[model samples]
Target chain A: SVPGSLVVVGGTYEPWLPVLEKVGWRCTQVADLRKPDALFVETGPCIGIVDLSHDEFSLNGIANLVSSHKQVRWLAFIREAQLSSDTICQFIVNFCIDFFTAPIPDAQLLSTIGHQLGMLKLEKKVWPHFGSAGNMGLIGESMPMKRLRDQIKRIGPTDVSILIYGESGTGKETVAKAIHKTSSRAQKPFISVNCRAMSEKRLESELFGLGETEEGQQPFLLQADGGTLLLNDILTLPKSQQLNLLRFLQEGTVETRQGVRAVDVRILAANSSDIEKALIDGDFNEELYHYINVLRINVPSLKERASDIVLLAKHFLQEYSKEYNAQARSFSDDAVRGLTRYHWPGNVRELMNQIKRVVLMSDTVVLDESQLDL
Target chain B: SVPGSLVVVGGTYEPWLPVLEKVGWRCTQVADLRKPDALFVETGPCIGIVDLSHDEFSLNGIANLVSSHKQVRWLAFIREAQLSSDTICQFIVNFCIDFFTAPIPDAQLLSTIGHQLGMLKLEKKVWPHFGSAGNMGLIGESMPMKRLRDQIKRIGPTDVSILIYGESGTGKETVAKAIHKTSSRAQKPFISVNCRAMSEKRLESELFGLGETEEGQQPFLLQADGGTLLLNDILTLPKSQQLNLLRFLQEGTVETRQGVRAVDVRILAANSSDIEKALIDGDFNEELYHYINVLRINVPSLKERASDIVLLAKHFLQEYSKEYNAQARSFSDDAVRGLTRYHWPGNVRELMNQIKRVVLMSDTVVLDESQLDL
Candidate 1:
């Protein structure tokens, strides 16, 4: 059985390759580190050995390559004298899993590779994508995200209404879906209506249903029976419509095209509005707010959890590459800086759109700040 | 040889344990899940198996246990029917490395365990301690921290003066030290003087040195010769002093009682003051600002990268426990929420202080929100 696969880049490790092969590791030498996908696709995801022992190498080029494929494990072979360079030390210390000083013996090198390979295998099989998105499609291990997930688990099975508060683009609807998917009525329909996306008249008719459909003209409430209806920007609903929603929530019934009827539906209301201020200003009905606020979840803004920005960016980059069928690329060092430094007023949605645009517009494998245009 | 160590908590898999033993696995059955330290300290850190098949486990208790020892790998033997409970699923999905549906055969169980053990071993060896402290004592993998480290690596070896900017308690001095440690003058004395901590007269005497000493007097700048002099809250320096410092920076010389002398110290000025506004207001000398702002480094506020709060908190907790010889404890779910939710106006110093106080005051293994008193 093969110990693992290896992509050896930079310098010549020809003598060691045969020995590595003898130990059941499939070793492939790579010429250019710019397009990691070129080598990674053919070899599949495996361990890397960057031969920094050779003086001739683009530190920036290797830096970007190593950063782009951060999911993969990497080791390095560097000259003992190269330790004095802070930049080189930073590169290896931050990126490589382990490093061997120059003129390293094959035996010691093989053992480290075998160890990392075991780790790579274990991660692939058992590691529960902690920083990456999990079952809820939430991509964060930040304290806020952890608390949000915990809240979802506790309140998901209950039939109580939920009010998801967050800035726009912060994935409020995603939380709503998570709650719905975790509920008893997961098999039924999960309907979402953006109250702010339409006019007051259009929203009212679309939500309560006024001859909008052919099959008995079912309202959003009736359509989501035994499931969930997420009212996006719930505070955007006009005062008159607020009363209507309040009555439906209070009585568990809605006025359908046919008649006022009972519906077993869970309301998951979401908005960027400060519900406390809205309640105080009488812009939103206190009774309606109380009904929907049975369980509250605050989706933190991108700024608050800025640590997850890079993880999210890379996550989006991977997603966009797959969705657009484009050459997957990694962010240049400057691009990573630009992406994180900017105040993401639009939150995750804006970051997602930026990555999507960058992937579609750029043909180069390394994405830089100029391309991001942040 | 023993494949690896395993701590199996809850339910009995007596028959499988013997089979596991035959394959060189040491399995220890744990009764109480509250104190993870008791078992971890003895077995040395290893993979964990939580048996949830018996359905006699406390979900919250297990969650706290698993979360407390996040560094350890965990797997579970959960009943298939228990999947319906979102809470149980959340616990397993978020905490466990992998899970086996109940009535798991011996061979299949051993294979999974072995796979995870390999991963645990790999992680113990190769993982770069990302999301953990590294050589610089910087404890974060957030985008901001990444950028900061990159900036330091680039400018650390240079002799140019740097003005480090950030809000109070953001660790400007730490950045200064990192730069100094990475520089060619690392072996020399590195001195830090807070300009705000002393009166203008005392600050002048302390920084420029006085004839009060019997031995040859060494100013802060001279004391840090061939190293770094970090003038914290530099904006607090009087205009006359600013001019004096600017002259020294320009001339690379200072006046001593023994007459004029040149010092090879690298000046690293830092503060929460906005140099832009300070310059525009004419409160700070424009030329002096230029001298200091040769290569500026902005330390991100704690609020901006809130994702790193928990990591830093835990780091501080571990540090405090070791320093104070206290029993290390884990933050309860509510405590985690409390710590992250509070906007750290005082940044890292405040956080470090809070964790230190909490660790010293609290006796419980699982620290709760009430004890934190956020």
Candidate 2:
């Protein structure tokens, strides 16, 4: 649209090239986006165009390079039929400036791309940091909330799948789904794979998407196609299954009796608190550990955000009291002090549950410390 | 000359700016070129102009900046009055592309500056790697020698001073002086303040340049002021002098019985091999210790480069034979093996001394192990 050259990734790009080139979009085609620094040097400061029209367009090592040189504006191309795919959406969100429905509507696509070039000239000031995985329907006015908000805000725009580390009941899943919900792939399913296993072979089959192959049933991974897969308690997953998970991560595809196929999703992991001990015991794969830790955001425990307790208590009381037909509205000074001093072992989830109980059961209009036990 | 910008370091530049600017020279003047990276973004891919016209402008940080971005061609300007000084000439040879004298001969200065600009457009590739301070004089093609040469070559062009670690009687001093020889300050005195104290106040007075205040003596530091000062066995220097040395390093000045003035020598310290052990013991001033260890290089001992012994033996034998009017020009094959197998406890210096003694005292054309006498 801007009448310039581009470094285009993947095929299915051949069709769009003629139209785009006629409007002055020359390009250097790269079959595999595995190495982009070399491609970047040859096609720099021009636009970067990635084709998501191909079903197998998965992971690549071009994120650091693309992000390193913010001057290169990247755009994505997808067919109207592929719009429902979650993997394509995640790919678009992470790497591109904008996407066009192919058979490029020259009038609309050309103008949009010309506008993208305008934005390219303006310097990108991405605040470089990360915090928690999710900030969903979460609220806090304190520094913990502000800092966490900053990280979630910054990470939401990138293609990198994050690994979140926090205590149990620290709103880790709430953070994970919030990440998926805010992303472009929000239209698709947000699947969860709980890793702490009491199950035996069922966990491995379910993880590798090889369950009931004779029955031909879809496992957890294929079900989450065109979406996000959040791995819960990843550290507690058995060593054998961890290798299966790592294989999928490295190859971006796992073979079974079914054939080599792709399940597209930005892989975000939620490992448990004792990951350090697990790693030290050699129960975790170090390389896989670092790969998932491309960006890490730690969800703070409730104790760390003490200033938000009163606000959180009130918000829950206001909503839950109406739902439960209760009178509890405000906290007495003693009740407020009680909440402030309480050691929240269960973190936010525990606090939310406790508040829900108190609002439903408290008889007083202003709940005192005695009415709500810590 | 090729026509563009330049980053000028230090003062006495205003007079030539008018003339240079007319012939397509633009400049970004830095008052003190202490750190080059800060100035790099502002003055890159252009020429680096250093002012030698100012008497005290002996060394500035532009070389590191210029060398790091090799395309930045550099030239100098000196007053005709200062042309004959050995220090100025050496500075030009090691650091500048070429230099011009005042009052600006417009014809010569203009063309040279233009020529420098032309060279700036060409890809500036400096073959990085180093050998003895003056490998113009040393030998050895072994791995240790190769690695050492590569390091010395890479480090010589920068403003960073180095720390050499090696066993006692090893070629540490040889390596240190060799580093200095290939640098801009080569002609300047290479002063070594003995760290091992034979007498108490003697070492202190000699270092402080104050044996007798009434006699008006400059310290070893002031003498090495326009050059490099190597502290022999720095870790063991007297406590009082260590503090003085640290001050001179940090402030580039030390307030003594004499009034405040200048001390600008690049600091090189010959520290003991532990450095790590010394640091762990908490025996050295941590700040002062780190200040000198900024760019560390290890000079391998004789055993580390044992293959060089035979070559070094032959070289020493030939040289001492000519000097002492002896007949010994080479060593017997068995004698060469004896030299290689023997522990060079005293290192290269001991090896040289032994070969000299054998070459002079032995009564043979080719010295045997018996004549060498260990």
Q: What is the interface RMSD of each candidate, in Å?
A: 15.7, 25.2
Which tens-of-lDDT digit does each residue in B1-374 have in candidate 1? 22233333433556566777787665556554334434543333355566665344434334334433232223223333234443224443332434554465777565556644553454334323333354845657675676566556545654566778888888888888887876767889888887886676756664465545335565667677677788899888888788767766645677566666886667778867545335433567765665565455668777567677888877777778889887656888877778777767788888988778877887777787665565
Q: Provide the lowest-lDDT 10-residue window in model 2 chain B.
A: B122-131
Ten-residue segment with the worst summed lDDT in candidate 1 chain A? Answer: A71-80
Model 2: runs farther than 4 Å from truth?
Answer: A1-124, A128-374, B1-134, B137-139, B198-200, B206-216, B256-259
Per-residue CA lDDT of model 1 for A243-356, tens digit only, reads: 877656544555655566566567778878665445535577755664676556777776656677878878788888888887766878877778778798889888888777
Query: What C-alpha lDDT, on a 0 to 100 scale, does residue B315 get in candidate 2?
Result: 74
Residue A231 accuracy (lDDT) in model 2: 83
TM-score of 1: 0.35
Question: At residue A221, what lDDT does model 1 achieve?
Answer: 74
* lDDT tens per residue, model 2, A1-374: 22234433344555556666686555556554334444443332345565544434222212223433222223222233335443213232222424545455655465545544433332122222223333333666565565566555545444356779887787778788766655556778778777676364777666454435555555667767777788888777777887877776644575445665666556789976544334423457655776576556768667667788788787877778888888667888887888877777777777789888777676789887775674
Position A125, candidate 1: lDDT? 43
- Interface RMSD against the true structure, candidate 1: 15.7
- Per-model C-alpha RMSD: 18.7, 24.3
